[PDB]
Amino acid sequence: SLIQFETLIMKVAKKSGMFWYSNYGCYCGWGGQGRPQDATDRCCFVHDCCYGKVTGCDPKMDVYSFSEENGDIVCGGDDPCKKEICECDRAAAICFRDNLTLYNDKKYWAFGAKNCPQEESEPC
Ligand SMILES: [Ca+2]
């Protein structure tokens, strides 16, 4: 569920998702339109696309299971649809971590919709 995604961003990237990734660029936040603006924004675009392709369960409310071992987040449980939500969230938390070199809140926080024209919307 979304609370577990916040948790994975805190564990993996050592940052709050609600503080640093809830209104950044065109896609980090609910929905999105336009071009991914930089690497962190493309991590958000891929996470949107990933949630968009989960069929069988609900990425917002279902609770998934995971363990930490061999130095990684390991998605588990007996339900394959809930394991795919977990995989979407794990991938995005790692992408954020790996792209901290480029993160630029000064330029991309609250970017604004004319900068994200609906005619430049990249398809998943
Ligand atoms: Ca989004």
PDB file of C-alpha atoms and ligand atoms in Angstrom:
ATOM      1  CA  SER A   1       0.000   0.000   0.000  1.00  0.00           C
ATOM      2  CA  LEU A   2       1.196   3.593  -0.159  1.00  0.00           C
ATOM      3  CA  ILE A   3       2.334   3.615   3.480  1.00  0.00           C
ATOM      4  CA  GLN A   4       4.629   0.621   2.715  1.00  0.00           C
ATOM      5  CA  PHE A   5       6.043   2.491  -0.353  1.00  0.00           C
ATOM      6  CA  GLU A   6       6.884   5.454   1.951  1.00  0.00           C
ATOM      7  CA  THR A   7       8.577   2.902   4.212  1.00  0.00           C
ATOM      8  CA  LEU A   8      10.671   1.374   1.385  1.00  0.00           C
ATOM      9  CA  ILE A   9      11.797   4.901   0.249  1.00  0.00           C
ATOM     10  CA  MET A  10      12.809   5.609   3.866  1.00  0.00           C
ATOM     11  CA  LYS A  11      14.684   2.299   4.220  1.00  0.00           C
ATOM     12  CA  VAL A  12      16.434   2.289   0.809  1.00  0.00           C
ATOM     13  CA  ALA A  13      16.969   5.962  -0.035  1.00  0.00           C
ATOM     14  CA  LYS A  14      17.084   7.227   3.591  1.00  0.00           C
ATOM     15  CA  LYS A  15      14.692  10.054   2.689  1.00  0.00           C
ATOM     16  CA  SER A  16      10.999  10.822   3.116  1.00  0.00           C
ATOM     17  CA  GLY A  17       9.007  10.213  -0.055  1.00  0.00           C
ATOM     18  CA  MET A  18       6.225  12.510   1.118  1.00  0.00           C
ATOM     19  CA  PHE A  19       8.756  15.329   1.623  1.00  0.00           C
ATOM     20  CA  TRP A  20      11.104  14.991  -1.340  1.00  0.00           C
ATOM     21  CA  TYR A  21       9.051  13.103  -3.991  1.00  0.00           C
ATOM     22  CA  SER A  22       5.458  14.138  -3.723  1.00  0.00           C
ATOM     23  CA  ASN A  23       5.492  17.163  -6.061  1.00  0.00           C
ATOM     24  CA  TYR A  24       8.651  17.044  -8.121  1.00  0.00           C
ATOM     25  CA  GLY A  25       8.948  17.436 -11.911  1.00  0.00           C
ATOM     26  CA  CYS A  26       6.002  16.218 -14.031  1.00  0.00           C
ATOM     27  CA  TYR A  27       5.487  12.783 -12.520  1.00  0.00           C
ATOM     28  CA  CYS A  28       6.654  12.575  -8.885  1.00  0.00           C
ATOM     29  CA  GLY A  29       3.294  12.879  -7.219  1.00  0.00           C
ATOM     30  CA  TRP A  30      -0.193  11.601  -8.160  1.00  0.00           C
ATOM     31  CA  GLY A  31      -0.826  11.374 -11.914  1.00  0.00           C
ATOM     32  CA  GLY A  32       1.496  13.253 -14.324  1.00  0.00           C
ATOM     33  CA  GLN A  33       1.658  14.528 -17.922  1.00  0.00           C
ATOM     34  CA  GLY A  34       4.425  15.803 -20.239  1.00  0.00           C
ATOM     35  CA  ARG A  35       8.006  14.644 -20.456  1.00  0.00           C
ATOM     36  CA  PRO A  36       9.944  13.099 -17.500  1.00  0.00           C
ATOM     37  CA  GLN A  37      12.282  16.129 -16.790  1.00  0.00           C
ATOM     38  CA  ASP A  38      15.314  14.355 -15.273  1.00  0.00           C
ATOM     39  CA  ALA A  39      16.395  10.950 -13.860  1.00  0.00           C
ATOM     40  CA  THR A  40      14.386  11.179 -10.547  1.00  0.00           C
ATOM     41  CA  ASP A  41      11.304  12.220 -12.568  1.00  0.00           C
ATOM     42  CA  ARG A  42      11.783   9.242 -14.933  1.00  0.00           C
ATOM     43  CA  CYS A  43      11.896   6.937 -11.791  1.00  0.00           C
ATOM     44  CA  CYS A  44       8.468   8.380 -10.934  1.00  0.00           C
ATOM     45  CA  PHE A  45       7.149   7.954 -14.467  1.00  0.00           C
ATOM     46  CA  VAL A  46       8.250   4.270 -14.489  1.00  0.00           C
ATOM     47  CA  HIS A  47       6.601   3.747 -11.062  1.00  0.00           C
ATOM     48  CA  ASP A  48       3.289   5.246 -12.473  1.00  0.00           C
ATOM     49  CA  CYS A  49       3.537   2.962 -15.472  1.00  0.00           C
ATOM     50  CA  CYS A  50       4.267  -0.037 -13.178  1.00  0.00           C
ATOM     51  CA  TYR A  51       1.190   0.592 -11.023  1.00  0.00           C
ATOM     52  CA  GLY A  52      -0.795   1.065 -14.203  1.00  0.00           C
ATOM     53  CA  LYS A  53       0.032  -2.497 -15.378  1.00  0.00           C
ATOM     54  CA  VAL A  54      -0.856  -4.345 -12.109  1.00  0.00           C
ATOM     55  CA  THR A  55      -4.118  -6.213 -12.770  1.00  0.00           C
ATOM     56  CA  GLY A  56      -5.693  -8.432 -10.107  1.00  0.00           C
ATOM     57  CA  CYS A  57      -5.173  -6.274  -7.029  1.00  0.00           C
ATOM     58  CA  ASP A  58      -4.847  -2.681  -5.906  1.00  0.00           C
ATOM     59  CA  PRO A  59      -1.466  -0.914  -5.489  1.00  0.00           C
ATOM     60  CA  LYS A  60      -2.878   1.812  -3.273  1.00  0.00           C
ATOM     61  CA  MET A  61      -4.520  -0.334  -0.648  1.00  0.00           C
ATOM     62  CA  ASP A  62      -3.168  -3.932  -0.717  1.00  0.00           C
ATOM     63  CA  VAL A  63      -0.526  -4.876   1.757  1.00  0.00           C
ATOM     64  CA  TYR A  64       2.428  -6.901   0.506  1.00  0.00           C
ATOM     65  CA  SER A  65       5.083  -8.904   2.345  1.00  0.00           C
ATOM     66  CA  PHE A  66       8.896  -8.402   2.174  1.00  0.00           C
ATOM     67  CA  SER A  67      12.005  -9.349   4.121  1.00  0.00           C
ATOM     68  CA  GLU A  68      15.494  -7.825   4.023  1.00  0.00           C
ATOM     69  CA  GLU A  69      18.382 -10.269   3.348  1.00  0.00           C
ATOM     70  CA  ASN A  70      21.701 -10.529   1.399  1.00  0.00           C
ATOM     71  CA  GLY A  71      21.632  -6.735   1.641  1.00  0.00           C
ATOM     72  CA  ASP A  72      18.389  -6.263  -0.479  1.00  0.00           C
ATOM     73  CA  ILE A  73      14.578  -5.827  -0.031  1.00  0.00           C
ATOM     74  CA  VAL A  74      13.103  -9.235  -0.994  1.00  0.00           C
ATOM     75  CA  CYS A  75       9.417  -9.202  -2.023  1.00  0.00           C
ATOM     76  CA  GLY A  76       7.555 -12.352  -0.858  1.00  0.00           C
ATOM     77  CA  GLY A  77       4.251 -13.766   0.174  1.00  0.00           C
ATOM     78  CA  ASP A  78       2.065 -16.373  -1.528  1.00  0.00           C
ATOM     79  CA  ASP A  79       0.171 -13.953  -3.800  1.00  0.00           C
ATOM     80  CA  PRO A  80       1.840 -13.064  -7.164  1.00  0.00           C
ATOM     81  CA  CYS A  81      -0.278  -9.923  -7.727  1.00  0.00           C
ATOM     82  CA  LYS A  82       0.834  -8.472  -4.346  1.00  0.00           C
ATOM     83  CA  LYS A  83       4.416  -9.414  -5.069  1.00  0.00           C
ATOM     84  CA  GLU A  84       4.240  -7.328  -8.286  1.00  0.00           C
ATOM     85  CA  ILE A  85       3.130  -4.200  -6.303  1.00  0.00           C
ATOM     86  CA  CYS A  86       6.099  -4.797  -4.026  1.00  0.00           C
ATOM     87  CA  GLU A  87       8.413  -5.063  -7.036  1.00  0.00           C
ATOM     88  CA  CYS A  88       7.138  -1.710  -8.457  1.00  0.00           C
ATOM     89  CA  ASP A  89       7.804   0.021  -5.108  1.00  0.00           C
ATOM     90  CA  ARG A  90      11.201  -1.616  -4.561  1.00  0.00           C
ATOM     91  CA  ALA A  91      12.418  -0.627  -8.088  1.00  0.00           C
ATOM     92  CA  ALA A  92      11.347   3.038  -7.577  1.00  0.00           C
ATOM     93  CA  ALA A  93      13.012   3.304  -4.062  1.00  0.00           C
ATOM     94  CA  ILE A  94      16.300   1.983  -5.583  1.00  0.00           C
ATOM     95  CA  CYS A  95      15.939   4.323  -8.638  1.00  0.00           C
ATOM     96  CA  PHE A  96      15.540   7.315  -6.239  1.00  0.00           C
ATOM     97  CA  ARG A  97      18.615   6.224  -4.239  1.00  0.00           C
ATOM     98  CA  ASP A  98      20.685   5.751  -7.389  1.00  0.00           C
ATOM     99  CA  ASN A  99      19.701   9.181  -8.767  1.00  0.00           C
ATOM    100  CA  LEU A 100      20.310  11.326  -5.685  1.00  0.00           C
ATOM    101  CA  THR A 101      23.389  12.737  -7.497  1.00  0.00           C
ATOM    102  CA  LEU A 102      21.043  14.655  -9.795  1.00  0.00           C
ATOM    103  CA  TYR A 103      18.169  15.511  -7.494  1.00  0.00           C
ATOM    104  CA  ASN A 104      17.353  19.216  -7.834  1.00  0.00           C
ATOM    105  CA  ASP A 105      14.519  20.567  -5.792  1.00  0.00           C
ATOM    106  CA  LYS A 106      15.369  24.177  -6.558  1.00  0.00           C
ATOM    107  CA  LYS A 107      14.567  23.600 -10.235  1.00  0.00           C
ATOM    108  CA  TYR A 108      11.872  20.893 -10.151  1.00  0.00           C
ATOM    109  CA  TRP A 109       9.677  21.231  -6.983  1.00  0.00           C
ATOM    110  CA  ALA A 110       6.236  22.430  -8.000  1.00  0.00           C
ATOM    111  CA  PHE A 111       7.153  22.530 -11.727  1.00  0.00           C
ATOM    112  CA  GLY A 112       3.625  23.448 -12.850  1.00  0.00           C
ATOM    113  CA  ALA A 113       1.374  22.140 -15.603  1.00  0.00           C
ATOM    114  CA  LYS A 114       2.195  24.436 -18.568  1.00  0.00           C
ATOM    115  CA  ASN A 115       5.734  23.065 -18.194  1.00  0.00           C
ATOM    116  CA  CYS A 116       4.223  19.618 -18.509  1.00  0.00           C
ATOM    117  CA  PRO A 117       2.128  19.982 -21.719  1.00  0.00           C
ATOM    118  CA  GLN A 118      -0.300  17.111 -22.253  1.00  0.00           C
ATOM    119  CA  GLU A 119       0.849  16.881 -25.932  1.00  0.00           C
ATOM    120  CA  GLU A 120       4.421  15.938 -24.745  1.00  0.00           C
ATOM    121  CA  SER A 121       3.126  13.035 -22.636  1.00  0.00           C
ATOM    122  CA  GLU A 122       5.439  10.064 -23.090  1.00  0.00           C
ATOM    123  CA  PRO A 123       3.452   6.745 -23.290  1.00  0.00           C
ATOM    124  CA  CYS A 124       4.524   3.901 -21.013  1.00  0.00           C
TER     125      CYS A 124
HETATM  126 CA    CA B   1       2.969  10.406 -10.798  1.00  0.00          CA
END
